[PDB]
Every structure is written in C-alpha cells, then in structure tokens.
Symmetry: D2
C-alpha cells in the first residue's frame, strides 16, 4: 500500500554536505516528499522523539548526537515506503553497509554504527509517532 515514513538526515551527513544527494536518491527511487524541514532538536526534544528507544542501547549518545547540530526531516510517501526506505538506507552499521549494499545511503555517507548518516522509521507504528513528532498535518503538502 501507499505509506508514509519519516527520514532524518543526521548531523554527520549534514556536515559531509550530503543532504541534496540523499534527497535526490529518494526522489529517484519514486518517493513523493510530503514535508521537509531543517530544525535543531533541543536535547529534551530529541529525548522525546526517541522515547521508545529510551530503554534500547545508546540512548544518551543518540540524544546528544541528534541535538548536536541541525538536522533535516522529510516525510516520504510511496508504495511500501517504510520497508523500501529501510532497504535504500542499508544496515545500521555503515561499515557493514559498504560490504553488502555499496550504494546504500549508509554505505555512501555513513561512518560507523553511530554516525550512520540517516534515521528512518522502523515500522508503521513508529512512522505514525515520528511523523507527528516533527510535522503537523498542516505541514503536509
């Protein structure tokens, strides 16, 4: 089905100058960008965004990194978007991405397992929460 998912381009990929190349890739893969915004998470807001992950490994590291500089979020819409976007971005470990998916976003622009260029929603439930965390319905266009 046609679905929406959230991506966030992380500060490592921002600093590498990869934003445009990353957006181009998703456009060329057939996704419609329905919302797009550069913003800066406060540490508190990054913590709230990652509320679910608060029990998973590296919560504080993630919150600190994701509030350490500006980021860009986008809502991507298309057939099977949640899974397809995950395939395009590649394995969480950027080094592993280079071994198994050389043209994935993380292979191309990621450094390691933490500085790995990009976030994407991992499920329908996460996508619903994450999209509303960043974008109101009024911002969808």
């Amino acid at each position: 089905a046609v679905e929406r998912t959230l991506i966030i381009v992380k500060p490592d990929a921002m600093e590498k100058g990869a934003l445009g190349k990353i957006l181009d890739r998703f456009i060329q893969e057939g996704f419609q960008i329905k919302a797009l915004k550069m913003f800066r998470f406060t540490p508190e807001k990054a913590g709230e965004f990652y509320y679910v992950h608060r029990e998973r490994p590296f919560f504080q590291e993630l919150v600190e990194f994701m509030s350490s500089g500006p980021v860009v979020a986008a809502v991507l819409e298309g057939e099977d978007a949640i899974k397809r976007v995950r395939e395009i971005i590649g394995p969480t470990d950027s080094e592993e991405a280079r071994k198994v998916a050389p043209n994935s976003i993380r292979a191309q622009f990621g450094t390691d397992k933490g500085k790995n260029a990009i976030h994407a929603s991992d499920s329908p439930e996460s996508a619903q929460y994450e999209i509303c965390f960043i974008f109101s319905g009024l911002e969808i266009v």
Copy 2:
C-alpha cells in the same frame, strides 16, 4: 488520568473578541496550555480535519465556516481533560447551552448550533488525531 485535548476557537468567537476570555477560562479551570497558535485552515485542510463529518448534514458549510477566517487552537492538559473541557464548553447547540449551562463557553459566546464558538476533541482517539493535525511534537512546550 492526565489527558490532552484540542480546542479550536472558531471564527465567530474570534470576531466577537472572545479569544482571551476563552483562554482565561481554561487556565482558571486548571488546565495547562501545552501548545497555542493562530492559523488559517485552507478549505482542503478544514475538510481533512473534519473528514469524519464528510457525509453528514452541513459539512460544506462547516468547511467554509472553519476556513473563513483565522482560528486559534490550543492543546489543553489536565486530569480528565477531555470530558472536563466538554463540560466547560457546553452543549453543541449554543441556545440549549444558555438554558442548561449559562456560564459555559457556548452559552457565553456561541450563537447557534453551527456558529458555536469552539471545537473540542470528543475522545482520546480523536484528540490524538486532531492534536497531530494542528501541532507537531516540536510545538508542544
């Protein structure tokens, strides 16, 4: 339990100059305002917000009215907020509100059953939808 609900001050109450009195009432009733802004629904966005009413009487008039001038929305937080806010605003029909709840928002500022000053979420599930329609998580402070 502590809940969040959405109110929208409609263009009738806006034009009557009642916005401040309405906000004051909810503050004095013990609610925390977690988000607030003035915006203007396009007809398309008003229709999406009210999508549940699409097949009901006076839907087109509702959409036109709600997009006819700026409105102000607020997220209100407090114990039993959804039910308590609906008790404070009074019956949909502003005339009936004047009969049974003279100090309700609709009794005080509502004209009739359509131009009835204020919208509030009906239920937990509609509050979740409506809050996300108007406000992102980044706007809740």
Copy 3:
C-alpha cells in the same frame, strides 16, 4: 498610521495564569491579533532576540528568565499601535506602574522591574526586527 507591534507574555505572567486576561485586554483596546503562538526560546535565541541589551546590566538574567519556560508572542495591529501598546502595558518597573497606571498590564500582572509580565516593541524599527524574529510572513493571518 496603522502599525504592527510585537508583544511577548513572559514566563512570570504565564505562571500567574494571566495570558488570557492579557490577550483580552488588547482585543478590547481595539487591536487585531495578526499572529499568535506559544514557543520556548533557547538561551541562544533569547540572546539573539535581545542582542541590543548584550552589554547592559542583567543581560544574563534576562536571557535565562526569557528561556526559563514557554512564552506567548502576538503581533498586534492598529492605529498608533506601538505607542498605544506601550501605554497599555505601563512603566517597565511594575511597582511604578501600580503607582501611576493601576490598570496597566504591568501594574496588574508584573512583579518588579525584571519580572514585569510582558515585552512590547519600542519603535517601528525594533518591531520590524522582533516580529520577523518570531513570526514569518506565512504566520501572519
């Protein structure tokens, strides 16, 4: 001439529950609210907003105070708005306001010369800067 000015309801008045009463006053004084929202200054953003005061007494306390909790800003439009809004809010020193203007905003809701309930633009040029700092043209409705 018709002018626009910016007000910010400061965290002291927010915590006192005065937001609605303050907005009501400006509505009743004949101003059009052209933009409105609740937000939270980061310390950095509060410092930029108040950059003119950077070398003045109590600047650090001003920045901390103004970033200590959410605030609400509004753009007010009307004839001679900049001067009239400053007459309505009263002297900076809330105690002096109680002596000379008992129904002024600062007399009614201000604590002292620092926690003085409300900010308003000083001049046409500062209004232009301050309005743009908080609100884009897209938010003026």
Copy 4:
C-alpha cells in the same frame, strides 16, 4: 561579506524531481543552508510575497504558478551569496541559460521564462524581505 539569500524551488522543478540536485549544487558551491521548508503558498500569500513585483510584468501568472503546487524554500549563507546564487541559477530565460551557462540551474532544470525552476532574491533589500516572509528567526538554525 557573508550574506544570506532566499531561494525557492518552483513547482516545475519540483515536478521534474530536481529538488535534491538543486540543493546539492548550492551545498557544493560552498553555501550553508540555514533554513529549509516545503510549504504551499495560498494565492494570497504568494501575492504578498511578490508585493514588490505587483507592478512588474506577469504578476498574476507568477502568483498563480507559485501557488499551483508545493515549493521548497531555503536560506543560503555564504560570501557574496546574493550575487553568487544569481550566477549559479543563470538567466531568467531558461532557453538563454542553455546558450550561455549550460550548467546553471535554469539551463539544467528550467523550461522557459516562466517555468524557470527557481527563484532567488535579487538584492540585499529583497533578501531581507523575502527571508522574513518565509522563515522567522526561530527557524534559522
């Protein structure tokens, strides 16, 4: 000097899928993206954005086109940004751009003089107005 300018990627380039390639170009040319947003101008808001141009040729055509689908605006910051961005985008007439500046944005993605892919501020005064029309200071990051 280091300056800020506004670009808006117009609906023609949006529909061609050129957004990412356009942003990449400005990143590679050395500009910092300080704000970025996808939004939809209402006809009224496009008219206000182009207030200055309201006497120049093709006002209504421009307003209609710029409100006909979503657009993406960005604030670009860098040395001599206003002029350098204009050089990168090329002549207003996309056909002329192809003749004299084949790698300009308008040569690459523009169709003609109206569907010409991109807007950029034409002067310091225009940049100041245009940036504030789309982005508040709070949105600069």
